[PDB]
Amino acid sequence: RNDRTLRRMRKVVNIINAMEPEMEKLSDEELKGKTAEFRARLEKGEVLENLIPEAFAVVREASKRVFGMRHFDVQLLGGMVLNERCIAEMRTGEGKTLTATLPAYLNALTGKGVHVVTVNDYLAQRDAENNRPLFEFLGLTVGINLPGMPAPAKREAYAADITYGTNNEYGFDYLRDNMAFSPEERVQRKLHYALVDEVDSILIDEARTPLIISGPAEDSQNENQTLASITFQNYFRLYEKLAGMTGTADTEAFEFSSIYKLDTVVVPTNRPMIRKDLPDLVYMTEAEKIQAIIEDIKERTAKGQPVLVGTISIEKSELVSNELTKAGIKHNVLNAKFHANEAAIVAQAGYPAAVTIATNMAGRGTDIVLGGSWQAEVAALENPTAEQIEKIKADWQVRHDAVLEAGGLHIIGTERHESRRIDNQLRGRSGRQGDAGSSRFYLSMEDALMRIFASDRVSGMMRKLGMKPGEAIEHPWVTKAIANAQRKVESRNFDIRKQLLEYDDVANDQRRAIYSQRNELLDVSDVSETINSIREDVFKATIDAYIPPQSLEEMWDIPGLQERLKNDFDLDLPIAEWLDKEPELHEETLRERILAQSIEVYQRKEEVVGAEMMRHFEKGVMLQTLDSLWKEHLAAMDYLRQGIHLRGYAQKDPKQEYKRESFSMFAAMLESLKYEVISTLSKVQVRMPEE
Amino acid sequence: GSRNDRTLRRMRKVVNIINAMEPEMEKLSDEELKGKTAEFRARLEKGEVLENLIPEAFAVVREASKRVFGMRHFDVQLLGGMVLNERCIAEMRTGEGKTLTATLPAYLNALTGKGVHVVTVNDYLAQRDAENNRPLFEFLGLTVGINLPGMPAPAKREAYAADITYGTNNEYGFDYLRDNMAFSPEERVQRKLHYALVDEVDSILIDEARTPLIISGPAEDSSEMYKRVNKIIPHLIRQVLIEELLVKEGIMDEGESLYSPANIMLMHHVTAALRAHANENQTLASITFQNYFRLYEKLAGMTGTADTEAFEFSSIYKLDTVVVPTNRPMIRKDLPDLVYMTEAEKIQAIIEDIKERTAKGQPVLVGTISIEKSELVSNELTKAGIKHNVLNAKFHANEAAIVAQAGYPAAVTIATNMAGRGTDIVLGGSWQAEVAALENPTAEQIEKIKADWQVRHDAVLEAGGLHIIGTERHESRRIDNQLRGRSGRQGDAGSSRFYLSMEDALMRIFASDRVSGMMRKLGMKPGEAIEHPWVTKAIANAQRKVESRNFDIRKQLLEYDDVANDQRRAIYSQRNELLDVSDVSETINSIREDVFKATIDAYIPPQSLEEMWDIPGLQERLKNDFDLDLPIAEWLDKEPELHEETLRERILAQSIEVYQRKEEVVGAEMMRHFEKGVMLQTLDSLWKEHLAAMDYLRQGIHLRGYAQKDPKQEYKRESFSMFAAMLESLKYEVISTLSKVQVRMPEE
Ligand SMILES: Nc1ncnc2c1ncn2[C@@H]1O[C@H](COP(=O)(O)OP(=O)(O)O)[C@@H](O)[C@H]1O
Numbered sequence A: 001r002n003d004r005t006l007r008r009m010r011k012v013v014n015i016i017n018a019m020e021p022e023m024e025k026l027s028d029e030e031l032k033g034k035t036a037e038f039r040a041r042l043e044k045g046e047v048l049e050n051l052i053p054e055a056f057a058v059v060r061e062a063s064k065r066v067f068g069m070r071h072f073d074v075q076l077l078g079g080m081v082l083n084e085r086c087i088a089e090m091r092t093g094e095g096k097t098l099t100a101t102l103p104a105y106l107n108a109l110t111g112k113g114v115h116v117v118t119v120n121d122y123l124a125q126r127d128a129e130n131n132r133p134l135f136e137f138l139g140l141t142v143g144i145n146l147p148g149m150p151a152p153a154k155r156e157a158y159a160a161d162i163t164y165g166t167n168n169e170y171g172f173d174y175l176r177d178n179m180a181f182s183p184e185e186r187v188q189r190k191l192h193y194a195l196v197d198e199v200d201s202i203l204i205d206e207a208r209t210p211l212i213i214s215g216p217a218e219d220s221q222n223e224n225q226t227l228a229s230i231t232f233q234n235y236f237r238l239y240e241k242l243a244g245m246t247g248t249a250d251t252e253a254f255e256f257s258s259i260y261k262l263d264t265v266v267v268p269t270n271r272p273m274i275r276k277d278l279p280d281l282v283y284m285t286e287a288e289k290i291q292a293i294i295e296d297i298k299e300r301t302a303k304g305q306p307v308l309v310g311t312i313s314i315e316k317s318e319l320v321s322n323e324l325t326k327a328g329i330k331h332n333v334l335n336a337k338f339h340a341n342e343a344a345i346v347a348q349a350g351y352p353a354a355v356t357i358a359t360n361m362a363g364r365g366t367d368i369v370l371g372g373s374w375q376a377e378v379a380a381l382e383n384p385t386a387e388q389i390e391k392i393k394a395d396w397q398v399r400h401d402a403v404l405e406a407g408g409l410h411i412i413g414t415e416r417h418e419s420r421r422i423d424n425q426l427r428g429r430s431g432r433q434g435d436a437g438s439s440r441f442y443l444s445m446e447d448a449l450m451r452i453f454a455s456d457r458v459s460g461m462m463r464k465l466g467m468k469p470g471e472a473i474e475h476p477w478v479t480k481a482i483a484n485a486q487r488k489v490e491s492r493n494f495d496i497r498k499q500l501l502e503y504d505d506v507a508n509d510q511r512r513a514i515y516s517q518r519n520e521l522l523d524v525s526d527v528s529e530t531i532n533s534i535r536e537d538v539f540k541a542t543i544d545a546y547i548p549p550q551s552l553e554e555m556w557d558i559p560g561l562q563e564r565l566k567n568d569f570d571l572d573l574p575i576a577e578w579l580d581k582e583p584e585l586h587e588e589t590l591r592e593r594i595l596a597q598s599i600e601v602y603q604r605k606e607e608v609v610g611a612e613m614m615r616h617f618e619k620g621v622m623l624q625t626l627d628s629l630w631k632e633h634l635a636a637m638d639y640l641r642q643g644i645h646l647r648g649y650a651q652k653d654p655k656q657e658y659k660r661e662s663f664s665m666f667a668a669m670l671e672s673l674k675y676e677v678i679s680t681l682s683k684v685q686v687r688m689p690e691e
Numbered sequence B: 001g002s003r004n005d006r007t008l009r010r011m012r013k014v015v016n017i018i019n020a021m022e023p024e025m026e027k028l029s030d031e032e033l034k035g036k037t038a039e040f041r042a043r044l045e046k047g048e049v050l051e052n053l054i055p056e057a058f059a060v061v062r063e064a065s066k067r068v069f070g071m072r073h074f075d076v077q078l079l080g081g082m083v084l085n086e087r088c089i090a091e092m093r094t095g096e097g098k099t100l101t102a103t104l105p106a107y108l109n110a111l112t113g114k115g116v117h118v119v120t121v122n123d124y125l126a127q128r129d130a131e132n133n134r135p136l137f138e139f140l141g142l143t144v145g146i147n148l149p150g151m152p153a154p155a156k157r158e159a160y161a162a163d164i165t166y167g168t169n170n171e172y173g174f175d176y177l178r179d180n181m182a183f184s185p186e187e188r189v190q191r192k193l194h195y196a197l198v199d200e201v202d203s204i205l206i207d208e209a210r211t212p213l214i215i216s217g218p219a220e221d222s223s224e225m226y227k228r229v230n231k232i233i234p235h236l237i238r239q240v241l242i243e244e245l246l247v248k249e250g251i252m253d254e255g256e257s258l259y260s261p262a263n264i265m266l267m268h269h270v271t272a273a274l275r276a277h278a279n280e281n282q283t284l285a286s287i288t289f290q291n292y293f294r295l296y297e298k299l300a301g302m303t304g305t306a307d308t309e310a311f312e313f314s315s316i317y318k319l320d321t322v323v324v325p326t327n328r329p330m331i332r333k334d335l336p337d338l339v340y341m342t343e344a345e346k347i348q349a350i351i352e353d354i355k356e357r358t359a360k361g362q363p364v365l366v367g368t369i370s371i372e373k374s375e376l377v378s379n380e381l382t383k384a385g386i387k388h389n390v391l392n393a394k395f396h397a398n399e400a401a402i403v404a405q406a407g408y409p410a411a412v413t414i415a416t417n418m419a420g421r422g423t424d425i426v427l428g429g430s431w432q433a434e435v436a437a438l439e440n441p442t443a444e445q446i447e448k449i450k451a452d453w454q455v456r457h458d459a460v461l462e463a464g465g466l467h468i469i470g471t472e473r474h475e476s477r478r479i480d481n482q483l484r485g486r487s488g489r490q491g492d493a494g495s496s497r498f499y500l501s502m503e504d505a506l507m508r509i510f511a512s513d514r515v516s517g518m519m520r521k522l523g524m525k526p527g528e529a530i531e532h533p534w535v536t537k538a539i540a541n542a543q544r545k546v547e548s549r550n551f552d553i554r555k556q557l558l559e560y561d562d563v564a565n566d567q568r569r570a571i572y573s574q575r576n577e578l579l580d581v582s583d584v585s586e587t588i589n590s591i592r593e594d595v596f597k598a599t600i601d602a603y604i605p606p607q608s609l610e611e612m613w614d615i616p617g618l619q620e621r622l623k624n625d626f627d628l629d630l631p632i633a634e635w636l637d638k639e640p641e642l643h644e645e646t647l648r649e650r651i652l653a654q655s656i657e658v659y660q661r662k663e664e665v666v667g668a669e670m671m672r673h674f675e676k677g678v679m680l681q682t683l684d685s686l687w688k689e690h691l692a693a694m695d696y697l698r699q700g701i702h703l704r705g706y707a708q709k710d711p712k713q714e715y716k717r718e719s720f721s722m723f724a725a726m727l728e729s730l731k732y733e734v735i736s737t738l739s740k741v742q743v744r745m746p747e748e
């Protein structure tokens, strides 16, 4: 764990580092050939992790030739973390994209494929095309999976060495593959490795979201229903190797373990992080709070320090905006209605004494360049020239160093959110890539978040410090108490979710079972041995209902057995005539003649239709019957789950009773499945030109 | 002499004069150009007409912009600027330089020293434009002001005292309103409303026409109201209702009704008391944008070739609209609308189009009405093997990167309710951008990037430029027009095509399911196709009937608003008269007479016999409302000889007498400012009372009832009637307040 894994990994980095001279003296085509060489050793039984030093040095050198970018040491480490069942926490702007090229390469080598999982189709395409040169230079192929892509193009994307696509599309492909009627219709290979780009949304927020295929035609208006379902959690759990990335904003390590058996490793930043996060400040009232904020801004901007003020609503942004104006402090508000205005304001938000106010600041952030962006500047030029640019960079170097000397970007949170990951994202907007920076959050006793101390009195004691319009002290214990209360809400919320997951696990295990069976059936061209085997189960169970085993003859319902056979097995047998003609029948030889009779009737149909046609008919029938009963069972399981309000109550766990019910329903479906297959095959009409 | 054609003919002659002035302006020093302003002002002071100044003043602005901004206005921008000097909307297409154009009218409309208000849609543009233009105009010897929310009143007065002011509609209006709550003239922050130049009139003037600006404060009557009214409630055995309800008390029952448009606040008290089972602010002041902008002596504004709404500007604001030509010929090819049986036939036709165009290297932008519709067309493009990108509103950084390459050869981009104006699509891609990954550029580097871009640029132009596919039209044609106008900007080749199907929602605008359902019979066979120009015109005419219909409905609302406006214009006119004078005594003396005459009329009927006089009603009336206890009867026992009119005189007289005493104790200046104060305050009170009671009458325009005996109109008459009653209660209450005012006399 911990530094032990990290210290061990650091030893590998020194080896990778020491290999670079050897790597720089190789030709491009020799570099290409290391992939062939890695695979030949793998073929001779080599352990993949033994190849990490050489494999990562090859990628680092290919990247410099191809991208003009050389993986940093910390990116080597992150690449190592992602080859295990691990989340790498890497800070924003640390290079997650390039880092991911490392484990992707390594885990492509055994020829089983790589699924790099993106949040949207834009990224899937962008990263596939950007990386295709790197990976072709190394003798690998790259695939792109999209919604709407024809099955042959998808098959091709999945046959590549490394594939890019969204989570949704991967999951939907799995479901549709589990509705195929021949193994050639499948688009995916075995699920080998999932490298997931942004695990907060993809693995945590979406864990229980069902992916569903829906079903126009059905059964006996005729509206549409669920044919196939899997949660995201249980899709990613089918993979042999699972890993992913997120930012240091974190707070959910214990969820990743609980939901996925994923460890999380915090990866060190390339440069030392020096952002000063100062103690949280508490004020009696919003008004005192806001005045404090105005005062901080006032002092900092006078120093030349840029500020970013994050609020929780439009109304509060307007309030702090109006008060800054009332104090004569120039600023800009990020207004969600004016996207162009916003990008233009962002661009210069790190300019000396810039003040920017943002409402529920969100996505990774567009970066804030200190001193300003100088590129927005040349971008704005219409015929930019050499001496023009260096003038521009020259004045910028000075603005940059000046903003740094002044303490870099100061972040002010005017309120904390209930989720600390949100606060962490705002504050992470400062101190990127080793830059000086600072952060401070403000609270009042009127703030909504004071309600997470589930007690007025407890909360309202804080006012006994008294605060007083200027003489503010600072108590560190408040920062920590607040962080503890956000942590408790998360814990509470998750405890509730994990009880929901334990229900989800009943469906999961059932789905895993039935899909395993289906796939066994799918992979086999001839299903005879099962048919024969299940025909005997079905005949025995059917017969038992009328001939209680080893009972006297007077308990037998030969009338009911005759019709049963007729109506379900198309089998019309003079059973009463047999008994009354052979005293020497006996039960067990009755069962045999019945079984034998259905079988020779089936053989006659087969002779008319043909063996191969028959084999394939059996297999189709088995798949189609599986599918029909499984859609039925999914709806029944659905109704049983929401019925969780009048069944298990006064000291019998409702969970334990649901599990009994669910197990009973599954076990019954599996018996129905055999019944219906044999009944279909029994009753299939065939024109006999004769007897 | 026709209309717009003739306008542009005459403006073009002026443009040729302005261009001829340019070498003269060139040769002038910077200080000489700065002096032009003072020289134009000396001319105006000696009686010159402003419009005689247009050519000189424009040559001056245009040469100042060269030297300062390094940009020289185009001839089309001179035209746009002359338009904006008139009560007109200059319609100039996206990309044409509205922001620079607007410096010309602003400069000219500043020369008379009365101020300009540039109106922006937000604070960011206000500020940016202010700062960007300060150097231009300070070069021309003028000053520039910025007005923002929260700005302190001194700062605000300075911004309005600048030559040219920038700010949002909202803040202009709110300043106005608060100026009308001032108790002294020096509290006002604005000057008289001279010229407003509105930057984007579609949102500011149309969409936002009826949006009220409201100042509220508890600034109210207290209670006792609620709780007297409470005390009926513990006998409401809920079994007719009105007579029951009426059942005595105060301020009603002399056989006066409860739902008189007059006892409206009272009735609201009971509607609230009894609806109550299942402080408050109040409006201190309100105005609409439409009625704010109508206060200005000159109004003008800009928008892009985004018309369709000309008839509403003229109807609502009396703004004419001039369509300004483009600096370069606008060659976008806007092709016949196509109509398909089914959504599915339509999409298939779209695909084939994108497919043939991208094979010849032309870029396509595909605009849809929803996310669902975007996913559909995208998936079908993927099914056809066609690469593209969707603009996903969740991924704003993705979207910016998509757009930057959206004019790239064979690029295909799908947009969901794409907005107006928006971020441009550069053909070939963006070449001063491309460098914006490039951390240390050189001689060779950009040169390269730029030449390479040229080849891409020229190849896209030769392929037809950007093609726009509208997959469905909107009900608003303005929107469709904003989408097609993404293409063919600044003289570039481009084209547009809109697609429609019988299954499309928009087919509903043809008020007959069967009349719509005819086209079916011109039955659109799959891969084949024809084009009929009458369909295109029919669709456009349908959209225009839908618009004109919604605007008939709006007009009716605006009739309601005309009542309010007329009442507020009149009371605020009375309020400002008062505010602007130190001494309101003549006003006061005049209205006490009026008040005293009429009060006496009510008991002594003019010319009456001394037995048609009621003094058991007259003297009480006096001691009650005026603190003026005159035992008149007991005079009248002594002088039977005196006569009605010289008794009215002696009545009057007294009140003056007792009031001059109150004054020689308080001080004349004190008394004078207390009187203006009483008059302002009383009018403020009654006004706010009126605003509330009308709000309540208006929401009687619901189920008090009636698509039947004309609700509106009855409303206008009850409202004007109550307004004219309020002006008389203002007079009576002022005089009551000043007659009852307590000030401690002498001693003993
Ligand atoms: N090793 C490197 N050498 C040079 N530039 C790098 C390196 N690693 C990443 N970058 C650049 O750093 C920036 C941030 O990387 P990105 O993957 O977009 O960041 P994040 O971790 O926030 O997703 C990008 O512009 C990327 O190309």
Ligand SMILES: Nc1ncnc2c1ncn2[C@@H]1O[C@H](COP(=O)(O)OP(=O)(O)O)[C@@H](O)[C@H]1O
Residues within 6 Å of the ligand: B071, B072, B073, B074, B092, B093, B094, B095, B096, B097, B098, B099, B100
């Ligand atoms: N006369 C000119 N010469 C050179 N560039 C100009 C001129 N007028 C405007 N532009 C530029 O044209 C671009 C678009 O102008 P803007 O005022 O934003 O256009 P729009 O009419 O669509 O609002 C801006 O970058 C602007 O600075």
